[PDB]
C-alpha cells in the first residue's frame, strides 16, 4: 500500500508584504515537489530525481494551479478574519491537506480532505467523499457555500481519479527508489552512569519507510518503566532513525533483549547484549 | 456578457497591437484563447484576479498579457507577423462554480499584413422590387449590395423606419471576391406588398465597415465608417 | 487530452433529428461543455455537465447525454431549425491539468430548407439613383437547385416570422450559367 499527500500553509504577516505561502507534495514517505511564495522562481520546483522526467507542459500546469491556490488562500484569510470578527492587523495560519491512498492492486482505498485554521480543524470531507463536516458555526457558512456548489463530487472525482491516476505514474517512473524498502541497520550500545547502573540503548538506523516498532523486553516480558523512546527522525538522505534506551542494573544486562520490527526485515530481529 | 475591444483590428507587420477585455462583474478568473480561421481555439494564458498563472509555453515572450486591477485584462503583441492573424477570445469564470463555466466575449479578429496597400471602403445601393413579383406573389423583396470593400470585415444590417428588423431578412454568410482584389456582399429584405405600396414607410441598408493610422494616398481615409443607402415607398 | 469530434461537417434538411458527438480520453472525470459560434461573433454556451445527472437540457432546444461507459457527451436536438447553421465546439476541462479548456476540432453544420410549394422565378429589381447596375433575384426555388463572364452569389434563406413563410434567394440572360428547370 502506498499514498500521496499535498500539504499547504499560509501564514499572514501584517505589514510585511503578502502572506507567506508554502505548499509541498508528498508521496507516502518521500517529498517530490515544493512551492514557496517568496522564492524568486515562482514556479513549482521539483524535490525528487525521478519527478524531473515530466515535460515542461506538466510544470506549466502545476505552477498555474499552485499559484491559484496561494491567491485563493490569501483571499481565504480575509474572509476568515471577518467570519470570526478578528483584528485585521493580526497574524494567523491557514492549513490544508488532502490526498489519496492506493492498494497493492493500485486500487482506490481511502480519500481525505481537511482544512485547518490556527491549528484546529475547520472543514473536512467525510469518508463518503460527498458530505462535509463543519467544526464550528463559522465553517458552516463556508459549508453552505461549498454545498451550493457541488464541491463534493469534484474532489471525489479528483481523489478517485486524477490523484490515483497520477500516483501510479509517479510510482512507475521512480520504482527504483519509492517502491523499494531499505532495511534498518541495528546495533546496541552501552553507557554506564554509576558503578551499578547502566543504560542500554538499542539503535536502528537507515530504514525506509519510517514505520518501525522497537520493544525492550526483559526475560520475555515487555518493559515500559525506565524506558525512553524518541520519535522517528529523518536522516536527510531518504532514511530514518530511531533509538530506545533503558536503564538497567549492572550485572543483569544479559537478561535484556531488544526486538525490532520493520517491513524491510522479513523476520523481526532479536538483539541481546 | 463579456465585452471586448476592439472587434476588428488591422495592422502592418512588425508593430505593436493592444486589446482590452471587460469581463462580468464579481468573476475572478480570465482566460485568453486564440482561434485561427476555421479551427479550434488555442489556449494562451489565464489569470486569477491578480496575476498570470499559466502561459502556453509555445507562445513566445513577445505576447504580453496582464490583468493589473483584477477587473480588465490587456493583451499586447509585439513584432507582429502574418502567422498571428486569428481571432483572440476572452473568457471569464467564477472558480466557485464546480462546473466552472467559462463565458466568452465577441472576440477580436486580427489581420496582419505586409503593408497597408489593400484598404478600400464599400459602395452601398438599394434596389426596389419589381411589379412582376408583386403582381404574382403579393410580396416585395428588396436587395442591398456592398461593392468593392477590403478586407471582409463588415457588419451589415437593415433598418425600417429607424428600427432594426430581422424577420424576412437574409444575408450571405460570407462575402465573395470580385477578382479571386476587393470583396462583394449581398443582402435582401422581403416585406408584404401592402408595406411597399405605402409611400410613408422608410427603408435603409446599413453596412458597418471595420484615427492614429497613417494615410499617404490622395483619397479619403478608409477608417471605420457606415455607408448607408435609403429607399422610400412607391405607388 | 485528445478531444475528438468525429462529425466534422453535417448538412441536413430542416426538421430532422441531430446528433453531434464528442469524446474524451477514457480516464478523466472532466468538465464538459458545448459552444456554438456564428461566423461573425464569438461563442455562446449551450450546455454543461459535470454535475451528476447524465442528460442535460440546454438553450435553443439542444440537449446532451453523458455516457461514462462510452466517454461520450453528444449534442442532440429533436428538430433542427434553419438558423442553427454554425460551427459547434465541445469544450472540456481536465481538472487535474488546470482549469483551461481544451476545445474540439469543430463541426461545421448547415441546414437547408424542406421547401413545400416551389415557385422559382427571376425578377429584375429597379436600379438605384446612385448605382449603374441591374440586379436579378432567383428566389422561391427548390433546395437541391445548384447555382453555377468577367457576379453570382450563393443562396441564403429568409424567414418571415409573421407569415411562417420561408424561401431562398440569389443575387446576380443572367442565370444562363446555372441549371434551372424548364418551368
Amino acid at each position: 500500500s502506498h499514498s500521496m499527500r499535498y500539504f499547504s500553509t499560509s501564514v499572514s504577516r501584517p505589514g510585511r508584504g503578502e502572506p507567506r505561502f508554502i505548499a509541498v507534495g508528498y508521496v507516502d514517505d518521500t517529498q517530490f515537489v515544493r512551492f514557496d511564495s517568496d522564492a524568486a522562481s515562482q514556479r513549482m520546483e521539483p524535490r525528487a530525481p525521478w519527478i524531473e522526467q515530466e515535460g515542461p507542459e506538466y510544470w506549466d500546469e502545476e505552477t498555474g494551479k499552485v499559484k491559484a491556490h496561494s491567491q485563493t488562500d490569501r483571499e481565504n484569510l480575509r474572509i476568515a478574519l471577518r467570519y470570526y470578527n478578528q483584528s485585521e492587523a493580526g497574524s494567523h495560519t491557514l492549513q490544508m491537506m488532502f490526498g489519496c491512498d492506493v492498494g497493492s492492486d493500485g486500487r482506490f482505498l481511502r480519500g481525505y480532505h481537511q482544512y485547518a485554521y490556527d491549528g484546529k480543524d475547520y472543514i473536512a470531507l467525510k469518508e463518503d467523499l460527498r458530505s462535509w463536516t463543519a467544526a464550528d458555526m463559522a465553517a458552516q457558512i463556508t459549508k453552505r457555500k461549498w454545498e451550493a456548489a457541488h464541491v463534493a463530487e469534484q474532489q471525489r472525482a479528483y481523489l478517485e481519479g486524477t490523484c490515483v491516476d497520477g500516483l501510479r505514474r509517479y510510482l512507475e517512473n521512480g520504482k527504483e527508489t519509492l517502491q523499494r524498502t531499505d532495511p534498518p541497520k541495528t546495533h546496541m550500545t552501552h553507557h554506564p552512569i554509576s558503578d551499578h547502573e547502566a543504560t542500554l540503548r538499542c539503535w536502528a538506523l537507515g530504514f525506509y519507510p519510517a514505520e518501525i516498532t522497537l520493544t525492550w523486553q526483559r526475560d520475555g516480558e515487555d518493559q515500559t518503566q525506565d524506558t525512553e523512546l524518541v520519535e522517528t527522525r529523518p536522516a536527510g538522505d531518504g532514511t530514518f532513525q530511531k533509538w530506545a534506551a533503558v536503564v538497567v542494573p549492572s550485572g543483569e544486562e544479559q537478561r535484556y533483549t531488544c526486538h525490532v520490527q520493520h517491513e524491510g526485515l522479513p523476520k523481526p530481529l532479536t538483539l541481546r547484549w | 456578457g463579456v465585452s471586448q475591444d476592439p472587434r476588428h483590428k488591422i495592422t502592418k507587420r512588425g508593430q505593436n497591437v493592444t486589446f482590452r477585455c471587460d469581463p462580468i462583474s464579481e468573476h475572478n478568473r480570465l482566460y485568453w484563447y486564440r482561434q485561427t480561421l476555421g479551427q479550434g481555439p488555442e489556449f494562451l494564458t489565464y489569470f486569477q484576479n491578480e496575476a498570470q498563472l499559466e502561459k502556453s509555453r509555445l507562445l513566445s515572450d513577445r505576447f504580453s498579457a496582464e490583468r493589473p486591477k483584477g477587473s480588465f485584462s490587456t493583451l499586447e503583441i509585439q513584432r507582429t507577423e502574418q502567422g498571428d492573424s486569428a481571432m483572440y477570445l476572452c473568457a471569464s469564470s467564477d472558480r466557485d462554480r464546480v462546473p466552472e463555466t467559462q463565458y466568452f466575449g465577441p472576440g477580436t479578429r486580427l489581420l496582419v499584413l505586409e503593408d497597408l496597400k489593400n484598404v478600400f471602403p464599400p459602395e452601398v445601393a438599394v434596389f426596389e422590387p419589381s411589379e412582376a413579383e408583386i403582381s404574382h406573389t403579393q410580396k416585395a423583396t428588396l436587395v442591398c449590395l456592398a461593392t468593392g470593400f477590403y478586407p471582409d470585415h463588415v457588419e451589415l444590417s437593415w433598418w425600417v423606419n429607424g428600427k432594426e428588423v430581422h424577420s424576412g431578412v437574409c444575408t450571405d454568410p460570407q462575402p465573395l471576391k470580385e477578382q479571386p482584389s476587393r470583396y462583394a456582399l449581398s443582402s435582401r429584405l422581403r416585406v408584404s406588398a401592402t408595406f411597399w405600396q405605402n409611400p410613408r414607410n422608410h427603408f435603409r441598408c446599413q453596412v458597418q465597415f471595420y484615427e492614429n493610422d497613417e494615410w499617404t494616398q490622395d483619397r479619403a481615409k478608409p477608417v471605420t465608417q457606415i455607408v448607408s443607402a435609403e429607399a422610400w415607398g412607391r405607388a | 487530452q485528445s478531444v475528438t469530434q468525429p462529425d466534422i461537417h453535417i448538412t441536413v434538411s430542416e426538421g430532422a433529428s441531430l446528433e453531434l458527438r464528442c469524446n474524451y480520453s477514457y480516464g478523466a472525470t472532466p468538465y464538459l461543455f458545448w459552444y456554438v459560434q456564428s461566423p461573425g461573433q464569438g461563442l455562446q454556451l449551450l450546455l454543461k455537465y459535470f454535475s451528476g445527472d447524465t442528460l442535460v437540457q440546454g438553450i435553443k432546444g439542444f440537449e446532451a447525454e453523458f455516457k461514462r461507459s462510452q466517454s461520450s457527451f453528444n449534442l442532440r436536438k429533436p428538430s433542427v431549425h434553419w438558423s442553427d447553421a454554425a460551427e459547434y465546439f465541445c469544450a472540456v476541462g481536465f481538472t487535474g491539468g488546470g482549469n483551461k479548456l481544451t476545445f474540439g476540432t469543430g463541426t461545421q453544420l448547415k441546414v437547408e430548407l424542406n421547401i413545400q410549394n416551389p415557385d422559382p422565378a427571376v425578377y429584375q429589381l429597379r436600379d438605384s439613383k446612385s448605382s449603374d447596375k441591374s440586379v436579378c433575384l432567383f428566389t422561391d426555388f427548390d433546395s437541391q437547385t445548384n447555382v453555377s463572364d468577367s457576379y453570382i452569389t450563393d443562396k441564403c434563406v429568409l424567414d418571415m416570422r409573421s407569415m411562417d413563410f420561408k424561401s431562398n434567394s440569389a443575387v446576380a440572360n443572367a442565370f444562363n450559367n446555372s441549371i434551372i428547370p424548364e418551368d
Partner: peptide, 8 residues
Amino acid sequence: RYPLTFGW
C-alpha cells in the same frame, strides 16, 4: 498532480 482549490 496538484488539485483544484476553492475559496470560502
